[PDB]
PDB file of N, CA and C in Angstrom:
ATOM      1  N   UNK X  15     116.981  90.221  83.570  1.00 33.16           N
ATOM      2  CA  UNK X  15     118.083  90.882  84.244  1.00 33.16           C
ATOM      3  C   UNK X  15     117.977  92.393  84.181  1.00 33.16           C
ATOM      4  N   UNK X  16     119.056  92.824  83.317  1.00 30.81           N
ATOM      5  CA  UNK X  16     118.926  94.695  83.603  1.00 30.81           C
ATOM      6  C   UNK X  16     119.515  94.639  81.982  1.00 30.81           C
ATOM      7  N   UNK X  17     118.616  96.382  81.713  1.00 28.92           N
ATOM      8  CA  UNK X  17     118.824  96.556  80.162  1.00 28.92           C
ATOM      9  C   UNK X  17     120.312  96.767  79.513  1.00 28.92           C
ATOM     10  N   UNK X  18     121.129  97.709  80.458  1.00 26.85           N
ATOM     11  CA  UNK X  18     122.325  97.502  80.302  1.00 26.85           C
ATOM     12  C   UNK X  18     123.279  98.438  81.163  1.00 26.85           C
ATOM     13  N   UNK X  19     123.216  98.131  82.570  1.00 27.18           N
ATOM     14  CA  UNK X  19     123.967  99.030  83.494  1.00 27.18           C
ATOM     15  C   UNK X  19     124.112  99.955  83.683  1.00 27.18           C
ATOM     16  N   UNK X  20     122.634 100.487  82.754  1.00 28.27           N
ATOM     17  CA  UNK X  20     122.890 102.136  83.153  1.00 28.27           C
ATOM     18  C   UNK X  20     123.472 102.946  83.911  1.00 28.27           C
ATOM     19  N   UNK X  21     122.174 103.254  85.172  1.00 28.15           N
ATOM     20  CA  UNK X  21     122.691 103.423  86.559  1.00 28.15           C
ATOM     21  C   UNK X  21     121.366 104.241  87.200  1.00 28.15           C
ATOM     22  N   UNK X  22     121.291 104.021  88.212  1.00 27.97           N
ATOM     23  CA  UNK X  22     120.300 103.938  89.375  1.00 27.97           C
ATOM     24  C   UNK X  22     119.682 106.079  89.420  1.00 27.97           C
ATOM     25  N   UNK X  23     118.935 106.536  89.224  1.00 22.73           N
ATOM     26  CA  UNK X  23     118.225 107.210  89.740  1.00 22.73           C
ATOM     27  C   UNK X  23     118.434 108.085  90.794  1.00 22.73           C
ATOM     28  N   UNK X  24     119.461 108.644  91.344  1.00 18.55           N
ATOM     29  CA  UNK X  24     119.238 109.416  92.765  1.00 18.55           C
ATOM     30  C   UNK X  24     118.037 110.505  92.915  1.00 18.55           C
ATOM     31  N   UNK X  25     117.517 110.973  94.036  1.00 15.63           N
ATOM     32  CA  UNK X  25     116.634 111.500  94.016  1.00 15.63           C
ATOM     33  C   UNK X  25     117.141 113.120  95.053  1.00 15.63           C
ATOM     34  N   UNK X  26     117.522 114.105  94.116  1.00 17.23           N
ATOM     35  CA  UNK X  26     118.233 115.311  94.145  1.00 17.23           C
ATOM     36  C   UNK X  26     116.895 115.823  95.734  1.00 17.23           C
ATOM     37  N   UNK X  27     115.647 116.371  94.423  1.00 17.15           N
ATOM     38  CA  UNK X  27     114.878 117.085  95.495  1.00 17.15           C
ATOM     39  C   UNK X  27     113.481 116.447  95.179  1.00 17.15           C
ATOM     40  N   UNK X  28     113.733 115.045  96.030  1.00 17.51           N
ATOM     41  CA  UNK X  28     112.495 114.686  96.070  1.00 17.51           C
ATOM     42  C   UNK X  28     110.787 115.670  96.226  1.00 17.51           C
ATOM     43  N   UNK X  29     109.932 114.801  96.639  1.00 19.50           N
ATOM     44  CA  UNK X  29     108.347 116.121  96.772  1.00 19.50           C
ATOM     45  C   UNK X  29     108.939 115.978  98.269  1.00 19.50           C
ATOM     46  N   UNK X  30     108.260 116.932  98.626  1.00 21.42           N
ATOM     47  CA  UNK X  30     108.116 117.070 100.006  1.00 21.42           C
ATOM     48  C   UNK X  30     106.750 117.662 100.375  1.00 21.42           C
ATOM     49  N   UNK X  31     107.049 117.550 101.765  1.00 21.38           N
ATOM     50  CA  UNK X  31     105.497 117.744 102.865  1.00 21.38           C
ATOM     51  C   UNK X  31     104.848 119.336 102.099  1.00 21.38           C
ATOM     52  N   UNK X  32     103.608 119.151 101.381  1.00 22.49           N
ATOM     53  CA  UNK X  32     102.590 120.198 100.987  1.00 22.49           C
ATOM     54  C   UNK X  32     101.724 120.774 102.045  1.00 22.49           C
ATOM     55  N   UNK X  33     101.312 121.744 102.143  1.00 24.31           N
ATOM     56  CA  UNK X  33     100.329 122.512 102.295  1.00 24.31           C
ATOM     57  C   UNK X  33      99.302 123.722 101.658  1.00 24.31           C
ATOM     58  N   UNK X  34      98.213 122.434 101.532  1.00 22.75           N
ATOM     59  CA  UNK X  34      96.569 123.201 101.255  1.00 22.75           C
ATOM     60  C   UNK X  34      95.784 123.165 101.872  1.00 22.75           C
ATOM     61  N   UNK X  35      94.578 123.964 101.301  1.00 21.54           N
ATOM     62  CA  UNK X  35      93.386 123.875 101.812  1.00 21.54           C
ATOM     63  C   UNK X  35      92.259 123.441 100.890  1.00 21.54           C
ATOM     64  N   UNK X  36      91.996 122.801 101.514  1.00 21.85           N
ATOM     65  CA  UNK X  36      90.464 121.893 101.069  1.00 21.85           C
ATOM     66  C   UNK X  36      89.967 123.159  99.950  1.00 21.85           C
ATOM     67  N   UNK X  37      89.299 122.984  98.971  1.00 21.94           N
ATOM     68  CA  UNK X  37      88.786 123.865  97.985  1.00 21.94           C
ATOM     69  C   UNK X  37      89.872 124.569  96.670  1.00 21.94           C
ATOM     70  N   UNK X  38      90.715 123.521  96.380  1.00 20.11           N
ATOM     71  CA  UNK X  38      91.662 123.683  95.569  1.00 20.11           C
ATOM     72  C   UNK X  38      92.576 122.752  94.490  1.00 20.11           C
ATOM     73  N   UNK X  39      93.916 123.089  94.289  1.00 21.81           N
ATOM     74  CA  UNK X  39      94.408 121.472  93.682  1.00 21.81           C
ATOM     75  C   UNK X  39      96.080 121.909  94.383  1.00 21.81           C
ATOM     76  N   UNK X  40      96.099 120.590  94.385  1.00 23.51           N
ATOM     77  CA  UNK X  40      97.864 120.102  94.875  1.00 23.51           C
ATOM     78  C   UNK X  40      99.068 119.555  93.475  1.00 23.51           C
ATOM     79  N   UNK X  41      99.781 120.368  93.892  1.00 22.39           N
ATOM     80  CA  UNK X  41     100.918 120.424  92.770  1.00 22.39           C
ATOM     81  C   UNK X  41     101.745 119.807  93.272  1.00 22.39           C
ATOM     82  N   UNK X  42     102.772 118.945  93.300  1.00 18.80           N
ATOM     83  CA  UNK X  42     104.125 118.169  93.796  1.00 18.80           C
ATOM     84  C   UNK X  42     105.236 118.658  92.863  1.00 18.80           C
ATOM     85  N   UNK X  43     106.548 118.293  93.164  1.00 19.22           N
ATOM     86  CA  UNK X  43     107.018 119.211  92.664  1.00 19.22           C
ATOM     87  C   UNK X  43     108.411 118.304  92.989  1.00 19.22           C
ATOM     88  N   UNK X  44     109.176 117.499  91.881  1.00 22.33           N
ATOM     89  CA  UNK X  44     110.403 117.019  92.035  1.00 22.33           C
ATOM     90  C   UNK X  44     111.540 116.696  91.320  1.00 22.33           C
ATOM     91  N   UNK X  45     112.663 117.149  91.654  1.00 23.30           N
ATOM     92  CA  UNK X  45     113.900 117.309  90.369  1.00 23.30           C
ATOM     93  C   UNK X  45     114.628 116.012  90.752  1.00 23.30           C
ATOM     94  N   UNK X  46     115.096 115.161  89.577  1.00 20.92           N
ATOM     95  CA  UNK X  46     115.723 113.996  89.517  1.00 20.92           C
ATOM     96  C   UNK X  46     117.333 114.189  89.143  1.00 20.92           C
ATOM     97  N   UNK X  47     117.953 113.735  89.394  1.00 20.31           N
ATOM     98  CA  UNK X  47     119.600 113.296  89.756  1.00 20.31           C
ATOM     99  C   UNK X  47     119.783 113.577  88.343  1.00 20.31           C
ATOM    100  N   UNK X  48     118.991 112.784  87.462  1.00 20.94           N
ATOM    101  CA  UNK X  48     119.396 112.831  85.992  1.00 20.94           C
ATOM    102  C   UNK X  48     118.151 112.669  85.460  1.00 20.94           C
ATOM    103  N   UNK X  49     118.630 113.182  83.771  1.00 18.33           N
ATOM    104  CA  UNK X  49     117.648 112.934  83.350  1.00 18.33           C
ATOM    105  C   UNK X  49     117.039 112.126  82.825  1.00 18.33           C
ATOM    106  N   UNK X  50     115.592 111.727  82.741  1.00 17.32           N
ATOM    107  CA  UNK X  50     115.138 109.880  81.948  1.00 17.32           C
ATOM    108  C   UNK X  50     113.989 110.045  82.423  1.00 17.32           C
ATOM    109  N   UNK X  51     113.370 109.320  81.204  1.00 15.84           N
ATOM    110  CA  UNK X  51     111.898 109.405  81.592  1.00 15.84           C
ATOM    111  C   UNK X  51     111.632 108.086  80.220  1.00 15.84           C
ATOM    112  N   UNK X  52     110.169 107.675  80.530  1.00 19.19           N
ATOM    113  CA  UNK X  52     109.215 108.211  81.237  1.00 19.19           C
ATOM    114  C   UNK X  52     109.219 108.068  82.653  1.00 19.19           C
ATOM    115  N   UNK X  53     108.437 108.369  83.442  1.00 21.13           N
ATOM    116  CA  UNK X  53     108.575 107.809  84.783  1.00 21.13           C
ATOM    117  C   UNK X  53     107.187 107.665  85.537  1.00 21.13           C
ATOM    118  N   UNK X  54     107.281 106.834  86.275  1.00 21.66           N
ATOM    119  CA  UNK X  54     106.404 106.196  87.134  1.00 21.66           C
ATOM    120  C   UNK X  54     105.630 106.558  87.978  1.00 21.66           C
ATOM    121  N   UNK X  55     104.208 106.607  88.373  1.00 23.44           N
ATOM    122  CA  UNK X  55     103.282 107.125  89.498  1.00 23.44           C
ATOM    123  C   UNK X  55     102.785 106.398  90.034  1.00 23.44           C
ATOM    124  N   UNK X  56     103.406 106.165  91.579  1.00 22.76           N
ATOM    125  CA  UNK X  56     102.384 104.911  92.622  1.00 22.76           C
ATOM    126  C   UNK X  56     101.856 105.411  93.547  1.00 22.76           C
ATOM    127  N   UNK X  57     100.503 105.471  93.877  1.00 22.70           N
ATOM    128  CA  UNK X  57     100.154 105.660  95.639  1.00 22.70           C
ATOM    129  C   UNK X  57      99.816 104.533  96.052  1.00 22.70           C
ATOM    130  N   UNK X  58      99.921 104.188  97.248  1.00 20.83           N
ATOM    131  CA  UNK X  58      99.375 103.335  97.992  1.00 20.83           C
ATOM    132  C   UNK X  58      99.404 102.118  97.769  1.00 20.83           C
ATOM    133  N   UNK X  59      98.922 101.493  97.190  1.00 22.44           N
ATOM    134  CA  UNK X  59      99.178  99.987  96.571  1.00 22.44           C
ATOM    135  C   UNK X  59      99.091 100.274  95.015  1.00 22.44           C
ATOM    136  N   UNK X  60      98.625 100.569  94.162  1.00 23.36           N
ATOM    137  CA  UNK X  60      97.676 100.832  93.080  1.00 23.36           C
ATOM    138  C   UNK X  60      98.882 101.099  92.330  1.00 23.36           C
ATOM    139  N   UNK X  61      98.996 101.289  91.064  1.00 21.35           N
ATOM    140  CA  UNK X  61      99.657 102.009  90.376  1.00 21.35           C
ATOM    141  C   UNK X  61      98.869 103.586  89.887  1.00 21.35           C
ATOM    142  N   UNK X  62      99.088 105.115  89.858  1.00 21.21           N
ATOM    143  CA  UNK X  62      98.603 105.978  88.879  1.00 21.21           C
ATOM    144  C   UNK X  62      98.559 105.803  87.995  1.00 21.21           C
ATOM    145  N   UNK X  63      97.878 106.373  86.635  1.00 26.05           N
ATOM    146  CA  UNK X  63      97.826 106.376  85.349  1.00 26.05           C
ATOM    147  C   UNK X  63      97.406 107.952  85.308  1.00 26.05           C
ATOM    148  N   UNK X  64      97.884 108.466  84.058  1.00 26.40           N
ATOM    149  CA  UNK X  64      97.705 109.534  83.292  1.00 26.40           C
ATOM    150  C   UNK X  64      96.295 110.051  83.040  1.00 26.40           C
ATOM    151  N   UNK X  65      95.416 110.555  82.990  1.00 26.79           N
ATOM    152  CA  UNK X  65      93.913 111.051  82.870  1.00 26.79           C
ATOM    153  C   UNK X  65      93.638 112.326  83.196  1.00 26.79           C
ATOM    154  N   UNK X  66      92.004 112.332  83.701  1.00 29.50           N
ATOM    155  CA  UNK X  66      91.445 113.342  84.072  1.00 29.50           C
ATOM    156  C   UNK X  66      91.619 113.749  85.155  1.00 29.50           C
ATOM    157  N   UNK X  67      91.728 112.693  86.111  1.00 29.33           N
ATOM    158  CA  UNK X  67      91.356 113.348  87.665  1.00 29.33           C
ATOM    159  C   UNK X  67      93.374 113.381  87.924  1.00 29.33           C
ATOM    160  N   UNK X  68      94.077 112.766  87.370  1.00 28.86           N
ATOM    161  CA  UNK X  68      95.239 113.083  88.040  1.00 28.86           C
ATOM    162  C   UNK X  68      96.022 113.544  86.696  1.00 28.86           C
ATOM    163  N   UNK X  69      97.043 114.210  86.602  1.00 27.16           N
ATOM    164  CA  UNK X  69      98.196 114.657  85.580  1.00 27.16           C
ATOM    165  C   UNK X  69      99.513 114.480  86.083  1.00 27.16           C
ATOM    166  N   UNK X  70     100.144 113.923  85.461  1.00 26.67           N
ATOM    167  CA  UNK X  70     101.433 113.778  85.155  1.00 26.67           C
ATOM    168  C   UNK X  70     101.952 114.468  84.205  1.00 26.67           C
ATOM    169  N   UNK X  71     103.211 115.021  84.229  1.00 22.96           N
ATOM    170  CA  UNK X  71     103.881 115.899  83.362  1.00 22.96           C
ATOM    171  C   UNK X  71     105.225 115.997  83.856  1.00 22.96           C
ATOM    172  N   UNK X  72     106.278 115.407  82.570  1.00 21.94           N
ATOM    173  CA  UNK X  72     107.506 115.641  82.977  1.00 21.94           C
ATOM    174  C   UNK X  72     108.293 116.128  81.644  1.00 21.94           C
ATOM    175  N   UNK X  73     109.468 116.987  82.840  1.00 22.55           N
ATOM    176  CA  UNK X  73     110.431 117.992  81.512  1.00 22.55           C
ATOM    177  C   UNK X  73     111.615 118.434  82.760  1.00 22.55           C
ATOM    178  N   UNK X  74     112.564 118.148  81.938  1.00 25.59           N
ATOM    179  CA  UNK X  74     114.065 118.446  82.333  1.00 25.59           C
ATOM    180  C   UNK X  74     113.621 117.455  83.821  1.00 25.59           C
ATOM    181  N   UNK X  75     114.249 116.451  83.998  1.00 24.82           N
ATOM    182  CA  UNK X  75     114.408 115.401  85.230  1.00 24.82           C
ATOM    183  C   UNK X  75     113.374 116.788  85.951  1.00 24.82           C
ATOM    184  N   UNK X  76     111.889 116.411  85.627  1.00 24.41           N
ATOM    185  CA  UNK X  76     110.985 117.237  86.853  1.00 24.41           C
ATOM    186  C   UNK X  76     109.795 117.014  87.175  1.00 24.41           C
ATOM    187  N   UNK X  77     109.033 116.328  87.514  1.00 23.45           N
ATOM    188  CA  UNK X  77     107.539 115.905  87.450  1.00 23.45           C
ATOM    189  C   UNK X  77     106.470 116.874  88.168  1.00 23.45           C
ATOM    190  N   UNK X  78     105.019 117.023  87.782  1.00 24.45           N
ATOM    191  CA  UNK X  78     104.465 117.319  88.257  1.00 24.45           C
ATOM    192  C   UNK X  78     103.299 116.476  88.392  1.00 24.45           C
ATOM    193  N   UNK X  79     102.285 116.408  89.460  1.00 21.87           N
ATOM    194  CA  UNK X  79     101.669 116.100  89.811  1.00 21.87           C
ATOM    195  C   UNK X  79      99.944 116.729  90.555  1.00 21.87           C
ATOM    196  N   UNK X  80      98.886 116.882  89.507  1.00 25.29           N
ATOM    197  CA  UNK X  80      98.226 117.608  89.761  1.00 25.29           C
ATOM    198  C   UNK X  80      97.381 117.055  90.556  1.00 25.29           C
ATOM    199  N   UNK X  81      96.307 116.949  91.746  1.00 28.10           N
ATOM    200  CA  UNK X  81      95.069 116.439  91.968  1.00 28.10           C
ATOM    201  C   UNK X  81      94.127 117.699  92.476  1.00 28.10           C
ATOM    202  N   UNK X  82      92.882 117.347  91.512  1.00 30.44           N
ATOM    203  CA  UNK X  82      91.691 118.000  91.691  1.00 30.44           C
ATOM    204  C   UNK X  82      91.063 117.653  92.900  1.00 30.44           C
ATOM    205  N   UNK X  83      89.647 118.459  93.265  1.00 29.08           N
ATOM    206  CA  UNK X  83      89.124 118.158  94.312  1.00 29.08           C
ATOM    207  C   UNK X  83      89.386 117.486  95.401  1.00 29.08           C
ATOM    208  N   UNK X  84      90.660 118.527  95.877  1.00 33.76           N
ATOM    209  CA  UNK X  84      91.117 118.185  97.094  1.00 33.76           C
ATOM    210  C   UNK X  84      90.336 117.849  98.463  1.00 33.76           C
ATOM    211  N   UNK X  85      90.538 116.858  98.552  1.00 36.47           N
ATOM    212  CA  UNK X  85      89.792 116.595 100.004  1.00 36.47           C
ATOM    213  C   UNK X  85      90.658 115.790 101.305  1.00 36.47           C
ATOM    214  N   UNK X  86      89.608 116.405 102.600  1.00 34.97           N
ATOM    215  CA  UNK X  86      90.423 115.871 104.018  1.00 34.97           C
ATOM    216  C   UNK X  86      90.581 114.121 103.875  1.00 34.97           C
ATOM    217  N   UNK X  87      90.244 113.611 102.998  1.00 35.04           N
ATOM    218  CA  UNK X  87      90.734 111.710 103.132  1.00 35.04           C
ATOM    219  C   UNK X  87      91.258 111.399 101.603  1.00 35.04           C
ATOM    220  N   UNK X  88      91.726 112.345 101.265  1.00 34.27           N
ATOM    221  CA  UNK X  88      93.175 112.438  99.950  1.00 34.27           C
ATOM    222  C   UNK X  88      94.175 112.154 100.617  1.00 34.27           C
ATOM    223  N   UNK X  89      94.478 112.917 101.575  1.00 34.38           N
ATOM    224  CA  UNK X  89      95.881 113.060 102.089  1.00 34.38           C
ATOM    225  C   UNK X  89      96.504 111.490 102.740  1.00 34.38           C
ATOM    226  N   UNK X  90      97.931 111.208 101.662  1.00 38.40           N
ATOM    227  CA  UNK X  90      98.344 110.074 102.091  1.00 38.40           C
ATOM    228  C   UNK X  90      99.340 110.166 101.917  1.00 38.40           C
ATOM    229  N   UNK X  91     100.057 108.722 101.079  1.00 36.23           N
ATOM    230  CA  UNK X  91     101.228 108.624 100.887  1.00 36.23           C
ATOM    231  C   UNK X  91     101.642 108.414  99.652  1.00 36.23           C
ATOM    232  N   UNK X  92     102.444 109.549  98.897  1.00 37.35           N
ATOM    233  CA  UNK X  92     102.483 109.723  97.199  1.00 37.35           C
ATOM    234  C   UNK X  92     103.780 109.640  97.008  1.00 37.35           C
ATOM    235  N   UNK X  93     104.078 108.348  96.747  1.00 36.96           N
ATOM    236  CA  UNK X  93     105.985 107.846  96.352  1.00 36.96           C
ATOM    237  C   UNK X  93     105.720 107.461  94.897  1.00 36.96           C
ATOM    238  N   UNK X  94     107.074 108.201  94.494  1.00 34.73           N
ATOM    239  CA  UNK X  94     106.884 107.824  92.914  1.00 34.73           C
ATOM    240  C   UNK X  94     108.265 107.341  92.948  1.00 34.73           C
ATOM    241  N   UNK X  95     108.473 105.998  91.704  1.00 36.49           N
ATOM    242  CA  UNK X  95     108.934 105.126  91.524  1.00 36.49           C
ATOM    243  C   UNK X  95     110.022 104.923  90.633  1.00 36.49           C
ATOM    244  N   UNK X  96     111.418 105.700  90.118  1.00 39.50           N
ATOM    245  CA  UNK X  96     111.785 105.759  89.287  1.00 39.50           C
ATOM    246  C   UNK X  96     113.202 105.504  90.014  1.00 39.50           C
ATOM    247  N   UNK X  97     113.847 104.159  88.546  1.00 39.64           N
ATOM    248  CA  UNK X  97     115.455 104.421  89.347  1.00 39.64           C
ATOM    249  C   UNK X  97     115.338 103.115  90.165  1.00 39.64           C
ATOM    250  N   UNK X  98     116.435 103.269  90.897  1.00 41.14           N
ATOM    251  CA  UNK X  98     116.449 102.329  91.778  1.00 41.14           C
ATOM    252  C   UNK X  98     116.220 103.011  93.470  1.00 41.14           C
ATOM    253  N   UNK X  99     115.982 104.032  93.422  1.00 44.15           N
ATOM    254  CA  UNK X  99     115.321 104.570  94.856  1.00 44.15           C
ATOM    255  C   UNK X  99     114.171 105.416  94.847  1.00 44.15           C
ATOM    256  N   UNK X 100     113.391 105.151  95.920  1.00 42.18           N
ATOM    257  CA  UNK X 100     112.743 106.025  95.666  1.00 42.18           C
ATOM    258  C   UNK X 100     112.013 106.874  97.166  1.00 42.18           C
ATOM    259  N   UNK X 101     110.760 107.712  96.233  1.00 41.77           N
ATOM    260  CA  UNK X 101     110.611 108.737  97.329  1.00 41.77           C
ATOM    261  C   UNK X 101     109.142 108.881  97.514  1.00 41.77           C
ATOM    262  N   UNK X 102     108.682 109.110  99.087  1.00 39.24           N
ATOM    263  CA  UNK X 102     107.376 108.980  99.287  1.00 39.24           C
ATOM    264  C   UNK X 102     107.252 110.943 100.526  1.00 39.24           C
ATOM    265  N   UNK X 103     106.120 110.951  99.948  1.00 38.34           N
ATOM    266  CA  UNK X 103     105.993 112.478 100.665  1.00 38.34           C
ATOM    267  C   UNK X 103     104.186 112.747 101.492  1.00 38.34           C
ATOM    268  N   UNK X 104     103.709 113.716 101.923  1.00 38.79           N
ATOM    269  CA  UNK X 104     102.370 113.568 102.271  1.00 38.79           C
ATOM    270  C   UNK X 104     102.097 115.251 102.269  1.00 38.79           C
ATOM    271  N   UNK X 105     100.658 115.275 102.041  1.00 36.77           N
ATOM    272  CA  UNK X 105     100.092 116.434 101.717  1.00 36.77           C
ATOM    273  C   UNK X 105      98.965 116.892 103.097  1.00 36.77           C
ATOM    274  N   UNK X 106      99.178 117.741 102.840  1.00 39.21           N
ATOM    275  CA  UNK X 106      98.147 118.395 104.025  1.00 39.21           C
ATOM    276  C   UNK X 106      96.743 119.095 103.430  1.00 39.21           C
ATOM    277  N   UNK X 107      95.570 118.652 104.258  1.00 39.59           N
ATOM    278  CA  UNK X 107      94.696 119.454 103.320  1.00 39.59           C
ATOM    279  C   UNK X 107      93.334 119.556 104.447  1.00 39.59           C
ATOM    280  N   UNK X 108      93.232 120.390 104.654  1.00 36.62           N
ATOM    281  CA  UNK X 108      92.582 121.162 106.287  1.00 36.62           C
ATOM    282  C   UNK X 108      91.318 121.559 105.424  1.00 36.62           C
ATOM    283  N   UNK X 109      90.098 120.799 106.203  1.00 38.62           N
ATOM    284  CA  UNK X 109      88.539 121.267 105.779  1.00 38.62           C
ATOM    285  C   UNK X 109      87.931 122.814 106.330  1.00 38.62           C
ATOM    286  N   UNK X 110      87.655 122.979 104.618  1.00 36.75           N
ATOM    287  CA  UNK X 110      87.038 124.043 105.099  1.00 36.75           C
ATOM    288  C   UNK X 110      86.607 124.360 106.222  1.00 36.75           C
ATOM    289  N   UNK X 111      86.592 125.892 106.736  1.00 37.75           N
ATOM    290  CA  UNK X 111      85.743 126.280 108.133  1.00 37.75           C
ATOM    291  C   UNK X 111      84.481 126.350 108.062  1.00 37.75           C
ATOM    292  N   UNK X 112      83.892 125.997 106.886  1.00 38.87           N
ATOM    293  CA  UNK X 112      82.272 126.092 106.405  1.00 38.87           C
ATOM    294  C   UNK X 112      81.761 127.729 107.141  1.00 38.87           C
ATOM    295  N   UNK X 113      82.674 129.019 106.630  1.00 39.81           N
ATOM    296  CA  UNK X 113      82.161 129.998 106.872  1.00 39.81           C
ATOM    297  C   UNK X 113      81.024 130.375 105.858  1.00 39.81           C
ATOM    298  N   UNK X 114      80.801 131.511 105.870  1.00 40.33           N
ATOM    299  CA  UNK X 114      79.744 131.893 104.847  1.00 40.33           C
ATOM    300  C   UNK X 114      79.870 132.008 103.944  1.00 40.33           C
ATOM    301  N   UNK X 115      80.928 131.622 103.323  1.00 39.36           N
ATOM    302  CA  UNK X 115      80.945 130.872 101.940  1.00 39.36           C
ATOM    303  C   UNK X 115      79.401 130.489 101.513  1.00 39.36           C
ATOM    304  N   UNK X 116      79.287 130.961 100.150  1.00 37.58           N
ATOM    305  CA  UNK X 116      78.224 130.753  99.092  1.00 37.58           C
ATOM    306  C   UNK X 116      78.086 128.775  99.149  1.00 37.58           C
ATOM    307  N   UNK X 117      79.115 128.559  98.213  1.00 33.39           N
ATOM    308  CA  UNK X 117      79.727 127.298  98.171  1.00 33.39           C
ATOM    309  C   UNK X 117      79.120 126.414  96.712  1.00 33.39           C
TER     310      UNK X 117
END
């Protein structure tokens, strides 16, 4: 059943629509109704986990969300799961112009 009627999660300022550029990292950025943790990371079907290539970090109802080596077939759909609602957002991430960049 349920642990004991807490109460449901609203989602104040969910992530919203990012913009980068290819050759960098993406930060997300979202304040929760209240506070409680730990909390949850899903993309796509999969569940996230905590590591190298992705970070999680939360303080005062706020998560962050780091990903390295941003690339043009990253960009999807990053809903995280906490509460009883939740919130899905998408990132933008435009390939390099392959100028004369060293590289």
């Amino acid at each position: 059943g349920s642990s004991g009627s807490s109460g449901p999660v609203r989602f104040q300022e969910a992530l919203k629509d990012l913009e980068v550029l290819e050759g960098g990292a993406a930060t997300l950025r979202c304040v929760l109704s209240s506070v409680a943790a730990p909390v949850k990371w899903c993309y796509g079907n999969n569940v996230l986990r905590p590591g190298d290539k992705y970070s999680l970090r939360q303080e005062g109802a706020m998560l962050e969300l780091v990903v390295r080596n941003l690339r043009p077939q990253d960009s999807g759909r990053y809903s995280c799961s906490f509460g009883d609602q939740t919130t899905s957002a998408t990132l933008t991430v435009t390939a390099l112009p392959s100028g004369p960049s060293s590289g």
